[PDB]
Amino acid sequence: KPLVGTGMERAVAVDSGVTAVAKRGGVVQYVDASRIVIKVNEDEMYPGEAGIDIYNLTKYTRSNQNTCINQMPCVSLGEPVERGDVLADGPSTDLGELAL
Amino acid sequence: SVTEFLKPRLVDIEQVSSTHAKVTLEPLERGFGHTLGNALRRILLSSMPGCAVTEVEIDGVLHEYSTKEGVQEDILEILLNLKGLAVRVQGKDEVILTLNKSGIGPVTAADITHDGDVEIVKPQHVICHLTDENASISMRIKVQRGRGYVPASTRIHSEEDERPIGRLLVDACYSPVERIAYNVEAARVEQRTDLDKLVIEMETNGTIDPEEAIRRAATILAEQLEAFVDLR
Amino acid sequence: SVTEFLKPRLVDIEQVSSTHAKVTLEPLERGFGHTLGNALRRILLSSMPGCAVTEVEIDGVLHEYSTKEGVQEDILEILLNLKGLAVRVQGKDEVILTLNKSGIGPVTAADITHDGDVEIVKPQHVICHLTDENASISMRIKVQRGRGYVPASTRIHSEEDERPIGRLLVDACYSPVERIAYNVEAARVEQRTDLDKLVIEMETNGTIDPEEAIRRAATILAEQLEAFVD
Amino acid sequence: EIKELLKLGDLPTSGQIRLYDGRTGEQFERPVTVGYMYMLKLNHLVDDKM
Amino acid sequence: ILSPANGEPIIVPSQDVVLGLYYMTRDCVNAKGEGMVLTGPKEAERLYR
């Protein structure tokens, strides 16, 4: 992360699609490098729905500039999350902040 | 008495922690400490024997850019964590350690089934995290002894023999000392009122004895200087 | 292994003159040449023992800025000439030598009173130029054995030993080392040019050979840390 | 504000400290400006251009 | 060594050599060792080192 920043790194990281974000808040049921399974809160479950959100991280996929795009999980097992929280940082991203 | 010089000697070893240490040499004449100090700083930091991890082998891992089920971080992160591991082995320059772990939680360096010779300096050093109950990790760690830093590029360029698929190569940093700070101050010996003493603060990984480190550096310096002494 | 290291076996020595050495040592370990050169230079500059002039007593001259009618050169010129003089005393640490000249005045170092213990490397080294025919110069110089360079400014303090007048203090310059420098270049051996090659340029006043001075400095440095190597 | 933040830590307010030459081991004549800076690696690799 | 356009030399220090040589030939007033008498440039270099 940049030691001296402008505070706009979080907005750029969130708005960019390289960073996975939680559609619904809940508790991280299962954390892994390949995939993340999150159990949503009872107030956000739709009727007739399992209530599990599965995020499949893209790992080591070539970009348009022949670079490496990798997503690494940020949250731990059992850590509560809310809507808009970052789950896995994308390339050149640290803790939801842009790191070029 | 001007022709003869006083003999410096080690007077005390002050170990602040397992890694941080302080070495005191006394007495010294005028700027001799400087003439020693930087020299020692240019020997301890540059060339020093040390143990480092060279190759890793995991049953479920095909290449360094892959991932394992049940582990939180990538295999490259595992290799990077293993690179910073500090170990001390005596009697030989080749050890094949084995690490077997299962269950929820971190995998510390204490989980390595070490032999009598191999001693782990940082038992609580973290390597990986297992977040699946039905997940087990078995790893073979190859550790050697050397000097300086060499990358895996030189090793693969040497090409002694073909490498079996799944044998990951990591960069070796054999240097066990990461910070050296020398300071020469006034010393109170006899009534000369001009002698000085040198204090060397060493921040290492804890795998090298500071007194043995100073002795090795002095031996290297004397061996190098004997060539100038002989000349032709 | 981890102890073989590397040593400079292509040692070359070139002598421009009798007091001029150009030494080349290769191959050396990466960075070791810098340490060796710096340590040798420091030892030669500030740790090499030697005998040199310390103070003068001019007859008829009291202060440094005074003037002498006999000699066309001023007093500081005489002090500089004395400082440039090199002597090789071995019988005693400190000794007084007396100079007395008259008549024509191309006075060089050969006119000094020759004692058994003291030896003059350069008797033809000029000292002063007395132009007047009926001019006589009498000098008493003190030569002591010390180490390194001791400027007269430091010796100015503690004037109790210098209470008698007429004792002009000059720079000591005990060490017979001048213009010592090192260069580090790259050397190639079995396809690795990270190896360093050390070039040492040395000049001496003539008391000892430059190679002898290098040998003495290296021996002193190696014997300094003999306790550690044991 | 930067000076106050520096004073909060055990660092000089002027931002310049005294460095020693690594090859020599000598106190530099003048203080130098040291710190921590954010550096980026551009997508111009020497091996690609060679 | 000489530019054919005008004859002025083009082999000149630009950035760091100029600063170094300017630092060389600058005189202070109360600098250490002021007022000393030296027998030659070699003594000056040895004193500085």
XYZ file of C-alpha atoms in Angstrom:
661
model
C 0.000 0.000 0.000
C 1.183 3.582 -0.651
C 2.567 5.143 2.518
C 1.602 8.590 1.189
C -1.719 8.542 -0.640
C -4.676 10.747 -1.551
C -7.563 8.652 -0.207
C -8.918 7.907 -3.694
C -7.246 4.482 -3.893
C -10.218 2.771 -2.235
C -12.706 4.289 -4.688
C -10.610 3.272 -7.703
C -10.145 -0.263 -6.371
C -13.847 -0.715 -5.583
C -15.144 0.788 -8.836
C -12.741 -1.319 -10.899
C -13.957 -4.855 -11.507
C -10.637 -6.502 -10.656
C -11.622 -6.654 -6.962
C -14.334 -9.027 -5.765
C -16.990 -7.388 -3.586
C -19.744 -8.921 -1.474
C -23.173 -8.562 -3.070
C -24.866 -9.306 0.267
C -23.617 -9.128 3.826
C -23.111 -12.189 5.966
C -20.529 -14.483 7.538
C -17.720 -16.080 5.530
C -18.580 -19.780 5.728
C -15.552 -21.071 3.804
C -12.419 -19.183 2.734
C -9.993 -20.613 0.184
C -7.684 -19.383 -2.555
C -9.786 -20.969 -5.305
C -13.251 -20.006 -4.052
C -15.096 -18.209 -1.256
C -18.459 -19.329 0.158
C -20.398 -16.797 2.242
C -23.577 -17.406 4.236
C -25.734 -14.283 3.940
C -27.750 -12.818 6.804
C -31.307 -13.986 7.423
C -32.646 -10.513 6.577
C -31.091 -10.600 3.085
C -32.159 -14.100 2.001
C -34.732 -14.138 -0.774
C -37.725 -16.471 -0.327
C -37.015 -19.992 -1.526
C -33.244 -19.466 -1.657
C -30.347 -21.490 -0.267
C -28.621 -18.346 0.999
C -25.040 -19.206 -0.023
C -22.981 -16.876 -2.223
C -20.071 -18.422 -4.131
C -17.250 -16.265 -5.509
C -14.785 -17.946 -7.879
C -11.521 -16.006 -7.989
C -9.615 -15.717 -11.259
C -6.084 -17.009 -10.653
C -3.133 -16.450 -13.007
C -4.982 -15.338 -16.135
C -3.087 -13.411 -18.798
C -4.118 -9.798 -19.313
C -4.222 -7.849 -22.573
C -0.621 -6.737 -21.911
C 0.677 -10.290 -21.270
C 0.766 -9.608 -17.523
C -0.581 -11.732 -14.658
C -4.028 -11.223 -13.119
C -4.428 -12.962 -9.762
C -6.967 -12.585 -6.957
C -5.959 -13.416 -3.389
C -8.505 -13.750 -0.554
C -8.421 -10.989 2.059
C -10.972 -12.055 4.677
C -10.536 -14.993 7.050
C -12.897 -17.772 8.074
C -15.755 -16.581 10.268
C -15.120 -12.879 9.648
C -18.424 -10.971 9.328
C -18.837 -8.984 6.111
C -21.332 -6.421 4.837
C -22.484 -5.206 1.438
C -19.713 -3.392 -0.409
C -16.896 -5.047 1.539
C -13.946 -6.437 -0.408
C -13.460 -10.212 -0.277
C -10.381 -10.799 -2.456
C -7.960 -8.172 -3.732
C -7.266 -8.106 -7.448
C -3.956 -7.387 -9.162
C -2.090 -4.343 -7.833
C -4.530 -4.074 -4.916
C -3.830 -4.349 -1.178
C -6.628 -4.508 1.416
C -9.032 -2.865 -1.011
C -6.584 -0.057 -1.845
C -4.872 0.477 -5.187
C -1.150 -0.352 -5.037
C 0.665 0.375 -8.304
C 56.443 2.023 22.593
C 55.368 3.876 19.454
C 56.414 0.938 17.262
C 54.341 -1.602 19.205
C 50.539 -1.593 19.097
C 48.115 -2.668 21.806
C 46.175 -5.885 21.261
C 42.387 -5.536 20.934
C 40.270 -8.347 22.323
C 36.634 -9.264 22.819
C 35.598 -8.133 26.293
C 31.857 -8.863 26.546
C 28.905 -10.277 24.615
C 25.550 -8.585 25.267
C 22.600 -10.463 23.741
C 19.574 -8.166 23.852
C 17.404 -10.874 22.269
C 17.802 -14.149 20.387
C 18.672 -12.164 17.235
C 19.794 -8.710 18.381
C 23.282 -8.805 19.876
C 26.151 -6.534 20.894
C 29.885 -7.271 20.654
C 32.518 -5.165 22.430
C 36.154 -5.052 21.296
C 38.750 -3.260 23.408
C 41.231 -1.587 23.374
C 42.021 0.204 20.091
C 44.531 2.903 19.150
C 43.300 6.139 17.514
C 41.394 5.425 14.265
C 42.214 1.707 14.174
C 38.629 0.965 15.184
C 37.379 2.645 12.025
C 39.988 0.732 10.022
C 38.502 -2.384 11.602
C 34.866 -1.332 11.931
C 33.822 -0.704 8.342
C 36.073 -3.592 7.310
C 34.161 -5.934 9.606
C 30.910 -4.386 8.389
C 32.096 -5.110 4.845
C 32.806 -8.760 5.718
C 29.919 -9.737 8.007
C 27.290 -8.310 5.647
C 28.884 -9.523 2.401
C 30.116 -13.120 2.808
C 28.906 -15.347 5.620
C 28.031 -19.062 5.810
C 24.380 -19.778 6.475
C 21.599 -22.292 5.986
C 18.857 -21.630 3.443
C 16.023 -23.503 1.754
C 16.715 -24.417 -1.878
C 13.973 -26.752 -3.152
C 10.437 -27.630 -2.058
C 8.212 -30.586 -2.941
C 4.455 -30.868 -2.359
C 2.432 -33.911 -3.397
C -0.628 -31.929 -4.481
C 1.288 -29.107 -6.199
C 2.135 -29.209 -9.908
C 3.827 -25.810 -10.314
C 4.575 -22.618 -8.404
C 1.660 -20.778 -10.074
C -1.040 -23.189 -8.849
C -3.292 -23.444 -5.800
C -4.102 -26.196 -3.311
C -7.512 -27.098 -1.919
C -7.925 -26.169 1.737
C -5.044 -23.659 1.891
C -5.801 -19.956 2.202
C -2.977 -18.493 0.096
C -1.232 -19.392 -3.144
C 1.693 -21.791 -3.459
C 3.918 -18.858 -4.440
C 3.085 -17.323 -1.060
C 4.116 -20.611 0.568
C 7.464 -20.493 -1.237
C 7.970 -16.850 -0.244
C 7.231 -17.687 3.399
C 9.628 -20.644 3.261
C 12.321 -18.355 1.836
C 12.405 -16.348 5.067
C 12.631 -19.424 7.292
C 15.701 -19.472 9.546
C 17.269 -22.821 10.474
C 20.542 -24.037 11.981
C 22.046 -27.387 10.962
C 25.506 -28.699 11.856
C 27.352 -31.814 10.733
C 26.284 -31.714 7.078
C 25.220 -29.285 4.358
C 22.088 -31.111 3.152
C 18.861 -31.817 5.050
C 15.474 -33.026 3.791
C 12.843 -32.007 6.344
C 9.225 -33.164 6.253
C 6.136 -31.215 7.319
C 2.791 -32.967 7.809
C -0.265 -31.072 9.005
C -4.051 -31.286 9.007
C -7.018 -29.555 10.593
C -8.203 -25.977 10.925
C -5.572 -23.394 11.766
C -2.131 -22.021 10.958
C 0.842 -24.269 10.240
C 3.797 -23.029 12.276
C 7.443 -24.012 11.876
C 7.139 -26.205 14.985
C 5.175 -28.735 12.901
C 8.351 -29.717 11.015
C 9.640 -33.133 12.107
C 13.216 -31.992 12.674
C 16.090 -34.323 13.512
C 18.557 -33.810 16.354
C 21.014 -31.778 14.282
C 18.439 -29.417 12.752
C 17.181 -26.756 15.169
C 14.350 -24.336 14.381
C 15.166 -20.792 15.478
C 11.613 -19.434 14.959
C 9.149 -22.177 15.973
C 6.125 -19.853 15.755
C 6.930 -18.649 12.226
C 3.804 -19.004 10.087
C 3.835 -20.807 6.734
C 0.231 -21.426 5.652
C -3.336 -21.695 6.943
C -5.673 -24.677 6.565
C -9.367 -23.757 6.423
C -10.875 -27.137 5.449
C -11.359 -29.986 7.914
C -10.722 -32.645 5.249
C -7.493 -30.993 4.084
C -3.981 -32.297 4.736
C -0.638 -30.818 3.679
C 2.537 -32.879 3.252
C 5.670 -31.018 2.191
C 9.342 -31.879 1.696
C 11.808 -29.048 2.340
C 15.375 -29.192 1.017
C 17.828 -27.071 3.023
C 21.529 -26.494 2.311
C 24.406 -24.312 3.509
C 26.110 -21.634 1.455
C 27.264 -18.039 1.179
C 25.750 -14.910 -0.310
C 22.631 -14.896 -2.464
C 22.127 -16.948 -5.629
C 18.857 -17.150 -7.609
C 17.170 -20.207 -9.068
C 18.240 -19.007 -12.529
C 21.849 -20.029 -11.874
C 20.706 -23.409 -10.537
C 18.550 -24.162 -13.582
C 21.345 -22.928 -15.868
C 23.753 -25.392 -14.236
C 21.386 -28.250 -15.182
C 23.001 -31.103 -13.271
C 20.020 -33.337 -14.093
C 16.376 -33.074 -15.076
C 14.031 -32.033 -12.285
C 11.035 -34.247 -11.460
C 7.691 -32.589 -12.103
C 6.468 -30.838 -8.968
C 9.869 -29.828 -7.542
C 9.645 -26.087 -6.923
C 12.809 -23.976 -6.855
C 13.084 -21.017 -4.476
C 15.694 -18.284 -4.222
C 18.385 -18.889 -1.604
C 19.520 -16.114 0.755
C 22.351 -17.742 2.701
C 23.319 -14.524 4.506
C 22.322 -14.830 8.196
C 23.112 -11.211 9.173
C 20.822 -8.406 8.016
C 22.028 -5.395 10.028
C 25.477 -4.320 11.242
C 26.171 -1.039 13.052
C 29.633 -0.245 14.416
C 30.406 2.622 16.787
C 33.826 3.590 18.159
C 33.876 5.456 21.472
C 36.320 6.400 24.208
C 37.695 3.535 26.301
C 39.007 3.796 29.869
C 41.988 1.428 30.065
C 45.015 2.160 32.291
C 45.937 5.885 32.085
C 46.507 6.237 28.335
C 43.428 8.508 27.999
C 43.535 7.960 24.221
C 42.453 4.338 23.661
C 39.094 3.576 22.060
C 36.669 0.659 22.107
C 34.374 -0.595 19.352
C 30.755 -1.677 19.853
C 29.114 -3.687 17.065
C 25.331 -4.075 17.054
C 24.281 -7.116 15.017
C 20.726 -7.910 13.919
C 20.725 -11.450 12.501
C 18.238 -14.296 12.094
C 19.536 -15.991 15.255
C 21.238 -18.884 13.441
C 24.799 -17.554 13.910
C 26.763 -17.047 17.124
C 27.864 -13.372 17.236
C 31.222 -14.268 18.792
C 31.698 -16.984 16.174
C 30.615 -14.458 13.536
C 33.290 -11.983 14.647
C 35.889 -14.761 14.770
C 34.973 -15.924 11.259
C 35.119 -12.377 9.880
C 38.530 -11.807 11.472
C 39.795 -15.132 10.109
C 38.612 -14.202 6.610
C 40.262 -10.780 6.851
C 43.569 -12.254 8.047
C 43.518 -14.927 5.333
C 42.928 -12.251 2.694
C 45.642 -10.002 4.159
C 48.266 -12.764 4.209
C 48.460 -12.406 0.416
C 49.434 -8.746 0.792
C 51.813 -9.682 3.616
C 53.681 -12.176 1.429
C 53.551 -10.052 -1.773
C 56.547 -10.979 -3.990
C 32.386 -25.376 -0.001
C 31.884 -22.159 1.981
C 35.506 -21.427 2.945
C 37.648 -21.647 -0.216
C 36.923 -18.008 -1.181
C 39.271 -16.546 -3.813
C 42.722 -14.987 -3.798
C 44.572 -12.580 -6.125
C 47.173 -14.674 -7.994
C 47.816 -12.334 -10.943
C 49.897 -10.022 -8.756
C 51.819 -7.440 -10.786
C 54.217 -4.769 -9.514
C 55.498 -1.849 -11.593
C 58.125 0.627 -10.382
C 58.049 3.988 -12.148
C 60.924 5.150 -9.927
C 62.638 4.086 -6.709
C 59.777 5.689 -4.719
C 56.839 4.892 -7.001
C 54.802 1.675 -6.887
C 51.861 0.564 -9.049
C 50.541 -2.765 -7.750
C 47.727 -4.803 -9.296
C 46.033 -7.682 -7.474
C 43.382 -9.845 -9.133
C 41.099 -11.755 -8.843
C 39.411 -10.678 -5.587
C 36.022 -11.466 -4.100
C 33.159 -9.105 -4.922
C 33.661 -6.039 -2.734
C 36.724 -7.350 -0.881
C 39.050 -5.121 -2.896
C 37.396 -1.999 -1.498
C 37.819 -3.172 2.100
C 41.447 -4.191 1.576
C 42.328 -0.940 -0.177
C 40.606 1.275 2.380
C 42.167 -0.551 5.330
C 45.644 -0.433 3.784
C 45.295 3.260 2.926
C 44.129 4.137 6.442
C 46.933 2.118 8.054
C 49.554 3.711 5.801
C 48.220 7.242 6.302
C 47.594 7.277 10.059
C 49.353 4.224 11.528
C 52.773 3.866 9.852
C 55.598 4.653 12.309
C 58.437 6.837 11.117
C 61.088 9.342 12.124
C 60.633 12.970 11.106
C 61.388 16.543 12.124
C 59.223 18.107 14.834
C 60.574 21.575 15.664
C 63.373 23.985 14.759
C 65.473 26.543 16.639
C 66.744 29.330 14.373
C 69.542 31.493 15.755
C 68.683 35.172 15.393
C 65.037 34.473 14.475
C 62.341 34.407 17.163
C 58.956 34.163 15.412
C 57.711 32.326 12.341
C 56.818 35.525 10.461
C 60.204 37.175 11.070
C 62.765 37.726 8.310
C 66.414 36.787 7.806
C 68.639 39.036 5.705
C 71.156 36.333 4.790
C 68.752 33.923 3.073
C 66.536 35.033 0.195
C 63.865 32.566 1.365
C 61.542 33.493 4.213
C 61.223 31.484 7.419
C 58.134 29.531 6.348
C 60.021 28.422 3.230
C 62.776 27.056 5.483
C 60.132 25.311 7.593
C 58.605 23.758 4.465
C 62.027 22.586 3.277
C 62.718 21.026 6.682
C 59.302 19.342 6.652
C 60.035 17.875 3.224
C 63.292 16.430 4.551
C 63.241 12.716 5.376
C 65.492 11.024 7.936
C 65.934 7.380 8.960
C 67.021 7.514 12.606
C 67.289 4.100 14.258
C 69.648 4.479 17.234
C 67.284 6.595 19.337
C 63.701 7.820 19.172
C 64.576 11.533 19.356
C 67.809 13.323 18.470
C 69.087 16.864 17.834
C 71.151 17.660 14.743
C 73.052 20.899 14.139
C 73.626 22.680 10.820
C 76.187 25.441 10.264
C 76.882 27.036 6.888
C 78.690 30.119 5.607
C 79.876 31.645 2.352
C 77.953 30.803 -0.803
C 74.511 29.589 0.152
C 73.178 26.691 -1.959
C 72.605 24.923 1.340
C 71.213 21.402 0.901
C 70.721 18.486 3.294
C 74.336 17.365 2.759
C 75.676 20.121 5.049
C 74.023 18.682 8.176
C 76.304 17.245 10.850
C 76.449 13.521 10.080
C 76.021 11.370 13.189
C 76.389 7.607 13.301
C 72.784 6.883 14.253
C 71.067 9.263 11.819
C 70.976 8.622 8.068
C 69.842 11.096 5.404
C 68.126 9.579 2.373
C 68.488 12.693 0.178
C 71.606 14.706 1.080
C 71.232 16.722 -2.141
C 67.750 17.943 -1.155
C 67.968 21.734 -1.039
C 67.301 23.562 2.236
C 67.982 27.277 1.770
C 69.533 29.857 -0.565
C 71.900 32.245 1.213
C 72.882 34.795 -1.442
C 75.114 37.092 0.620
C 78.738 35.955 0.697
C 79.311 37.055 4.308
C 76.198 35.311 5.647
C 76.229 32.493 8.204
C 73.312 30.240 9.158
C 73.110 28.129 12.325
C 70.206 25.721 12.826
C 69.249 23.081 15.392
C 66.547 20.649 14.254
C 64.837 17.998 16.385
C 63.872 14.677 14.793
C 61.647 12.234 16.673
C 60.009 8.899 15.895
C 56.216 9.004 15.874
C 53.189 7.674 13.999
C 50.954 9.147 11.322
C 50.591 12.888 10.783
C 50.725 15.311 13.716
C 49.998 18.914 12.684
C 51.579 21.800 14.556
C 48.127 23.149 15.466
C 47.528 20.248 17.861
C 51.011 20.667 19.358
C 50.352 24.395 19.879
C 48.365 23.514 23.002
C 50.266 22.730 26.214
C 52.901 25.405 25.606
C 54.721 24.618 28.874
C 57.171 22.380 27.002
C 57.583 25.137 24.381
C 58.045 27.970 26.892
C 61.606 28.790 25.682
C 61.492 31.155 22.723
C 62.807 30.435 19.243
C 61.256 26.948 19.052
C 59.251 27.024 15.820
C 56.870 24.079 15.478
C 56.528 22.354 12.102
C 54.258 19.552 10.951
C 55.459 16.128 12.058
C 54.708 13.930 9.014
C 56.026 10.799 10.711
C 54.528 8.373 8.197
C 56.724 7.891 5.075
C 53.586 7.654 2.920
C 52.373 10.194 0.366
C 49.858 9.995 -2.496
C 48.395 6.579 -1.695
C 45.314 5.704 -3.731
C 43.290 2.691 -4.829
C 41.180 1.857 -7.875
C 38.714 -1.026 -8.200
C 37.929 -2.585 -11.583
C 36.232 -5.734 -12.867
C 38.073 -8.998 -13.526
C 36.801 -12.051 -15.411
C 37.535 -15.582 -14.174
C 35.583 -18.693 -15.287
C 32.742 -16.492 -16.568
C 31.964 -14.188 -13.647
C 33.114 -10.558 -13.745
C 31.712 -9.612 -10.338
C 35.278 -10.289 -9.170
C 37.155 -7.125 -8.230
C 40.707 -6.167 -9.184
C 42.581 -3.733 -6.943
C 45.155 -1.235 -8.227
C 47.279 0.504 -5.586
C 49.291 3.636 -6.392
C 51.922 4.518 -3.798
C 54.667 7.111 -3.367
C 57.239 7.325 -0.578
C 59.642 9.972 0.688
C 62.571 7.572 0.171
C 63.170 6.234 3.687
C 61.821 2.792 2.727
C 60.771 1.107 -0.488
C 57.038 1.392 -1.272
C 56.730 -2.399 -1.397
C 58.414 -2.559 2.015
C 55.921 0.000 3.336
C 53.013 -2.044 1.961
C 54.438 -5.196 3.559
C 54.851 -3.444 6.913
C 51.323 -2.012 6.832
C 49.818 -5.387 5.923
C 51.821 -7.112 8.666
C 50.711 -4.538 11.250
C 47.066 -4.877 10.223
C 47.185 -8.687 10.241
C 48.906 -8.775 13.638
C 46.387 -6.299 15.080
C 43.557 -8.870 14.991
C 45.696 -11.902 15.877
C 43.726 -12.343 19.110
C 40.454 -12.662 17.185
C 41.819 -15.156 14.645
C 42.865 -17.510 17.464
C 1.948 19.343 9.908
C 4.705 17.217 8.355
C 7.240 18.676 10.792
C 4.911 17.975 13.724
C 4.397 14.385 12.557
C 8.168 13.951 12.271
C 8.584 15.371 15.782
C 6.009 12.851 17.026
C 8.448 10.107 16.075
C 12.123 10.025 16.996
C 13.206 11.728 13.779
C 14.727 15.144 13.035
C 12.309 17.884 12.049
C 14.439 19.047 9.106
C 14.016 15.648 7.434
C 17.745 15.310 6.681
C 19.938 12.854 8.587
C 23.656 12.040 8.489
C 24.725 9.133 6.280
C 27.977 7.173 6.131
C 29.595 5.946 2.926
C 29.257 2.182 2.627
C 32.532 1.672 0.766
C 34.503 4.034 3.026
C 32.721 4.474 6.358
C 33.056 8.247 6.562
C 30.674 10.895 7.888
C 29.340 12.795 4.882
C 30.187 16.487 4.708
C 26.552 17.591 4.473
C 23.290 15.998 5.628
C 21.331 14.200 2.925
C 17.586 13.928 2.352
C 16.453 10.373 3.108
C 12.989 8.938 3.486
C 10.504 6.424 2.125
C 9.137 6.911 -1.385
C 6.609 5.100 -3.563
C 8.323 3.812 -6.713
C 6.661 2.165 -9.707
C 8.025 -0.294 -12.270
C 6.958 0.731 -15.765
C 6.078 -1.793 -18.464
C 9.379 -1.257 -20.323
C 11.553 -4.295 -19.607
C 15.145 -4.277 -20.831
C 14.993 -7.899 -22.007
C 11.985 -7.170 -24.226
C 13.744 -4.215 -25.871
C 17.054 -6.045 -26.368
C 35.714 16.937 -29.798
C 34.663 20.099 -31.694
C 31.188 20.756 -33.058
C 31.352 21.423 -36.828
C 28.375 23.789 -36.519
C 30.323 26.522 -34.717
C 33.692 25.100 -33.608
C 32.859 25.189 -29.904
C 33.795 22.002 -28.015
C 31.078 19.466 -27.240
C 33.128 17.340 -24.811
C 32.173 19.054 -21.549
C 30.910 18.023 -18.122
C 27.171 18.550 -17.766
C 25.579 17.719 -14.400
C 27.596 15.896 -11.730
C 31.210 16.653 -12.658
C 30.375 20.369 -12.644
C 28.865 20.145 -9.157
C 31.803 18.104 -7.881
C 34.394 20.523 -9.243
C 32.425 23.470 -7.855
C 32.478 21.774 -4.449
C 36.240 21.286 -4.890
C 37.150 24.930 -5.522
C 35.052 26.651 -2.846
C 36.693 28.462 0.069
C 35.203 28.876 3.536
C 36.486 31.187 6.295
C 36.633 29.138 9.520
C 37.090 25.718 7.926
C 39.120 23.045 9.688
C 42.837 23.281 8.995
C 42.758 26.921 7.894
C 46.036 28.824 7.986
C 48.234 25.746 7.580
C 51.261 25.664 5.274
C 51.598 22.690 2.923
C 54.693 21.534 1.043
C 52.688 20.378 -1.980
C 49.437 18.967 -3.353
C 50.323 15.493 -2.060
C 50.310 16.752 1.529
C 46.940 18.416 0.919
C 45.446 15.178 -0.413
C 46.903 13.153 2.461
C 45.539 15.634 5.014
C 42.080 15.582 3.423
C 41.952 11.775 3.282
